[PDB]
Amino acid sequence: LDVLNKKYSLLDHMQAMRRYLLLGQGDFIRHLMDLLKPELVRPATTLYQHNLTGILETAV
Amino acid sequence: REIITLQLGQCGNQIGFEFWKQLCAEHGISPEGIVEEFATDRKDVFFYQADDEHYIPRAVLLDLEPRVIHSILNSPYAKLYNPENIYLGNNWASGFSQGEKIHEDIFDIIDREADGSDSLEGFVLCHSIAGGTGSGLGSYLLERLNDRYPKKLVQTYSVFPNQDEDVVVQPYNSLLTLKRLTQNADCVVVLDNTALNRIATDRLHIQNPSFSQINQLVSTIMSASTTTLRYPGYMNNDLIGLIASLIPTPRLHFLMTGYTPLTTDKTTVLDVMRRLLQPKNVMVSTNHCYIAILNIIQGEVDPTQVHKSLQRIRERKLANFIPWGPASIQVALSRKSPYLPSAHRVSGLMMANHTSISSLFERTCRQYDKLRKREAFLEQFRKEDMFKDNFDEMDTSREIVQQLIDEYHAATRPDYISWG
Amino acid sequence: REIITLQLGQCGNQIGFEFWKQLCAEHGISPEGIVEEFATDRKDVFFYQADDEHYIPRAVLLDLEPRVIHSILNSPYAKLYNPENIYLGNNWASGFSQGEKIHEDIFDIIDREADGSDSLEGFVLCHSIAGGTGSGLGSYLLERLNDRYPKKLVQTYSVFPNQDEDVVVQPYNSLLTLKRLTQNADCVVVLDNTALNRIATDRLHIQNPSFSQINQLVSTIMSASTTTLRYPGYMNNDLIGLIASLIPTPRLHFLMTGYTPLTTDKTTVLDVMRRLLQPKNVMVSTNHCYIAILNIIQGEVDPTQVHKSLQRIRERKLANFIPWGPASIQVALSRKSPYLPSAHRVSGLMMANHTSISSLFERTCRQYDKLRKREAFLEQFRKEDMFKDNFDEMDTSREIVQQLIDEYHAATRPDYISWG
Amino acid sequence: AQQERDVRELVRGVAGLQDEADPNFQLALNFAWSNFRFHRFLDVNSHKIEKTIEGIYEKFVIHSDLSKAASWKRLTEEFLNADAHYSILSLLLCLSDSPSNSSYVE
Amino acid sequence: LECSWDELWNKVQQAQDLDHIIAAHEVFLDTIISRCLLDSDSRALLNQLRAVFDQIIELQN
């Protein structure tokens, strides 16, 4: 258990399993969806993955 | 998001300085702007990032016939920001007329930081009612930012001047500024100078050095107002998320204050909740009932006794709310602030809508009616004559605030489904 | 390949001297021509190889009524080259008429080094607009090299004279020379004397010794323009490889400048990229949008954060380009120059096409229209009367540059698929 | 033979043109047959179809619509037991590829 | 996310077996499945929740 929680960082993954997926941080995910408003308002015909994977980085 | 804070007047600049100094104390930063290398949290809530571990705070200071601004100026807390925004009668018309001519250059100073700010949420006004030079000037500038920005939020921290008595034009100034406050402001945080004087005489036996200890209480409330934003919470990490529940309609947008110690020279969250219900612990002084309450706790976390306390404040039955609506007092939990020593590790804060302040408004209205009929208290200067030859704008202001009192008393009733 | 550099006029010879002196500083060579024995790179980009570790620089200097050329002459930097090419009114017609008669011997001096040069790429003009003797003479010589060489490229480093005001024939001179610039030049690098004055008053508080510090900034830009050629890069190691992306059509061939420090008395490539986007850091001062940009970086190399920064300047959205086209700001990385001490080890440079300079052109056009209608500012000498009795060539020049303004504004539109 | 009557009936049904002596009927029919004979698609990839069906099932399980997920799996597995299968599936898929997500009350 | 986070945080922070970490994850997730309206029985509640979400987008119009 000792080598697992530091060499592969088991606990840190749980901590960010809460913060991001369960919104357990809240701030970063709110700044995502604030910036993600024009794209989600747009029809998904003309949405492509480069626009999502770009704006996520500006957020981070 | 990001909020540019806006201070004018003598007292308003004092709270702007005091709040920014207290935020320097709260974050792990030097008073010179340098961030500490022994420091998790956010230090970018209101701060422009320079390089030298410099988060330059985003605050614009304004002055008119400056006295106390010079004493603010010579300080080690003047090296944190000051992007060179200093720019130079005690009536409302004095501040209004003097702001009239110079509005463009101070608004250019505003637009400077506006394009400087990539992100924006709101503008916070550090105002003082019947402060003389602050009155008129602040309402004029409030009209200008509202006219220029229909996309932004405005919250005003303003004093209610009542110290049980000399200035005789005070109800006139408060009447006009409150007219601008009702129709040109999105958010109002009001406090009683009398109630803070009462709590100051509670915690000590001072009468002369009241101002500095008043600064202590106001800095506590102002820091507690922003703790959910400056430290990562989960909801009301924006101004608007905090604001939206509190205002059911923009005639009811005046917000109440609370701080749970009386003297600041295990208790569960229920106890501070139940006494934050008490009006002896509220810092602002038929039956009045709350329209919506939100409470905020920062300190020791009992993970299940929250809902246990919730059932308890229910069945206590100390506060019955608005009849014609689903009005709840609502719970927020935040982190207690690191990087500073703290007495009273549990600390509470209430934001609410209550109908009790309509009494204070009709007090000012009745005093204004008395002085207006008695006709010796407008003090007849060239400012007021050039502003209005016939002085009907004050009459219109009294009419509108009387209409607002009528709206308050009609909202006080169990039936406010019909208009008025 | 090899480029013969061509300087005339007082200011143009000053930058020719300053650039060649700075290249002496940059390469491991003495000011006497001797290459250093403590020295990888190329020292043959513009230099004829003699024996005594002598790379003789390939530069032809030209003068008319010389004042500053004598001060250039007595120097230890006059022993690097000078293959004996010295050869002797402030109007355009003065320089034009005086160049008219002596064109053959200076062109023979040109042909001397032309057969002397085994390899050739282009000719660089060190010009100054409204410099008096430089004006007219430079445009005449430009016409002659274009007429003789349809196989070669011409780039002109020229000043835009605007110092906020006396010479009243200046818009006439600029108008005629710009007519020759549009139709007889392949490449134009323009800068604002006003913007360099602004940045000089930014970095210091000088007003009188502006010329020497202007020489500093121009030498930095001129060295950065040639770093990819003088030091082995991979692309734009030729003039034409650099030029070809920048000009989408030879009415749009006027190129913009950039240098990333303001004061020259870890930061990533993104930061200098994003602020080389800002017009306060551009050394040349409806919505204008860029037609093509190329940026050049010399310094610290982060091998993957280039593309990371690229995605970042994308999603930043500070610069939206031309609608009717695939216009990108494009990245070039070069070696930071050895053999000299350097402050600001990271340094950036932008070449772009922007529509903003059409404003400066219509400024000169409107001033010319005013002075031409007012009719006291042609200054009526024998040069102008012998050159044109009826003075319609200036009218034709104004017509052509007005047509060019129309082309600029039509290119500014989202539709420039139709002509005009 | 039956093919031709079918293309007639398809025009009648989808286009709402029940009179063969309308010129619009013959124009729609000529359009339909000219579209059929303009060979411009690759033949149906059964594996890509299978992937798409499985993904539809995953989208149903992600959205907690279990009655729809169970119905989707059950109906598709029954249909794929006795080429033309994957054909009709791709047909329906392209046909209304809008979102079509609610469709409850099995 | 404060009760269930605490439950999970206890049965991970003590856990003397890797299996106890595992059987801690399992139940914490399934408790969240139950507290949210995601069961084969609580469909009827979710159905009304979707109709309380409908009128929000209706009012905007």
UniProtKB/Swiss-Prot annotation, chains B, C:
GTP binds at residues 130-136. GO terms for biological process: cytoplasmic microtubule organization; meiotic spindle organization; microtubule cytoskeleton organization; microtubule nucleation; mitotic cell cycle; mitotic sister chromatid segregation; mitotic spindle organization. The modification Phosphoserine is found at residue 119. The keyword Secreted does not apply. GO terms for cellular component: apical part of cell; cell leading edge; centriole; centrosome; ciliary basal body; condensed nuclear chromosome; cytoplasm; cytoplasmic microtubule. The keyword Nucleotide-binding applies. Its main location: cytoplasm. Gene3D superfamilies: Helix hairpin bin, Tubulin/FtsZ, C-terminal domain, Tubulin/FtsZ, GTPase domain. It is found in: Cytoplasm, Cytoskeleton, Microtubule organizing center, Centrosome; Cytoplasm, Cytoskeleton, Spindle. One of its GO terms (molecular function) is identical protein binding. Keywords: Cytoplasm, Cytoskeleton, Disease variant, GTP-binding, Lissencephaly, Microtubule, Nucleotide-binding, Phosphoprotein. Phosphorylation at Ser-119 by BRSK1 regulates centrosome duplication, possibly by mediating relocation of gamma-tubulin and its associated proteins from the cytoplasm to the centrosome. It comes from the Eukaryota. Tubulin is the major constituent of microtubules, protein filaments consisting of alpha- and beta-tubulin heterodimers. Gamma-tubulin is a key component of the gamma-tubulin ring complex (gTuRC) which mediates microtubule nucleation. The gTuRC regulates the minus-end nucleation of alpha-beta tubulin heterodimers that grow into microtubule protafilaments, a critical step in centrosome duplication and spindle formation. Belongs to the tubulin family. This is Tubulin gamma-1 chain. It comes from Homo sapiens (Human). The gene is TUBG1.
From Swiss-Prot, chain D:
It is found in: Cytoplasm, Cytoskeleton, Microtubule organizing center, Centrosome. Widely expressed, with highest levels in heart and skeletal muscle and moderate levels in brain. It comes from the Eukaryota. Coiled coil: none annotated. Component of the gamma-tubulin ring complex (gTuRC) consisting of TUBGCP2, TUBGCP3, TUBGCP4, TUBGCP5 and TUBGCP6 and gamma-tubulin TUBG1 or TUBG2. TUBGCP2, TUBGCP3, TUBGCP4, TUBGCP5 and TUBGCP6 assemble in a 5:5:2:1:1 stoichiometry; each is associated with a gamma-tubulin, thereby arranging 14 gamma-tubulins in a helical manner. Gamma-tubulin at the first position is blocked by TUBGCP3 at the last position, allowing 13 protafilaments to grow into a microtubule. Component of the gamma-tubulin ring complex (gTuRC) which mediates microtubule nucleation. The gTuRC regulates the minus-end nucleation of alpha-beta tubulin heterodimers that grow into microtubule protafilaments, a critical step in centrosome duplication and spindle formation. Belongs to the TUBGCP family. This is Gamma-tubulin complex component 5. The gene is TUBGCP5. The chain holds residues 13 to 128 of 1024 of the full protein.
Curated annotation (Swiss-Prot), chain E:
Disulfide bonds: none annotated. It is found in: Cytoplasm, Cytoskeleton, Microtubule organizing center, Centrosome. Ubiquitously expressed. It comes from the Eukaryota. Component of the gamma-tubulin ring complex (gTuRC) consisting of TUBGCP2, TUBGCP3, TUBGCP4, TUBGCP5 and TUBGCP6 and gamma-tubulin TUBG1 or TUBG2. TUBGCP2, TUBGCP3, TUBGCP4, TUBGCP5 and TUBGCP6 assemble in a 5:5:2:1:1 stoichiometry; each is associated with a gamma-tubulin, thereby arranging 14 gamma-tubulins in a helical manner. Gamma-tubulin at the first position is blocked by TUBGCP3 at the last position, allowing 13 protafilaments to grow into a microtubule. Component of the gamma-tubulin ring complex (gTuRC) which mediates microtubule nucleation. The gTuRC regulates the minus-end nucleation of alpha-beta tubulin heterodimers that grow into microtubule protafilaments, a critical step in centrosome duplication and spindle formation. Belongs to the TUBGCP family. This is Gamma-tubulin complex component 3. The gene is TUBGCP3. The chain holds residues 727 to 787 of 907 of the full protein.
